[PDB]
Design a protein around this ligand. Structure first.
Ligand SMILES: CNC(=O)[C@H](CC[S@](C)=O)NC(C)=O
Length: 167
């Protein structure tokens, strides 16, 4: 398989992970902590010590089935790109919205996508578009959280992932 990876931050990684895991073309989704100032942070560090990390989902997708653009469109369906450090009740910099890339050629792709998304929003978009500085896997307890606990905390509607994309 020809795969690619992209890092997405859009609030609680429980809902976001579950969301991307149900999309045909997504090979994997790992919840972790990205672009922080500390190394190997625990949930407690990120949540209370202000290590600066953002709850992020590492998404691996079939580069032959989906484009980075498709992934971004899916992402825009469940993330409010206009709220600063807040998605639902999850408030704090650890829930900031952002797209982190490992390839510099993707910055222009992400920026262009954000510009198109901005066309349909009256309020200014506040989604970060930055390189993946650092990524650290969240505790195993957090992996496949909603698959293990179907009635677990989730404020995004994962059924939006079933709706097809243009053409
Ligand atoms: C009980 N609810 C929570 O713990 C969620 C955190 C889940 S997120 C994947 O960090 N937030 C609050 C405020 O309770």
């Amino acid at each position: 398989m020809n795969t690619r990876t992209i890092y997405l931050a859009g609030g609680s990684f429980w809902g976001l992970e579950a969301y991307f895991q149900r999309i045909d073309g997504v090979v994997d989704a790992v919840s972790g902590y990205a672009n922080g100032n500390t190394k190997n942070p625990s949930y407690e560090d990120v949540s209370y010590r202000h290590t600066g990390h953002a709850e992020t989902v590492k998404v691996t997708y079939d580069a032959d089935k989906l484009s980075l653009d498709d992934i971004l469109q899916y992402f825009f369906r469940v993330v409010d790109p206009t709220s600063l450090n807040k998605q639902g009740n999850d408030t704090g910099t650890q829930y900031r919205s952002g797209v982190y890339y490992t390839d510099p050629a993707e910055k222009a792709v992400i920026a262009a996508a954000l510009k198109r998304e901005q066309q349909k929003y009256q309020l200014p978009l506040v989604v970060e578009n930055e390189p993946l500085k650092n990524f650290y896997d969240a505790e195993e307890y957090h992996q496949d959280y909603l698959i293990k606990n179907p009635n677990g905390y989730c404020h995004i509607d994962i059924r939006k992932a079933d709706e097809p994309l243009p053409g």
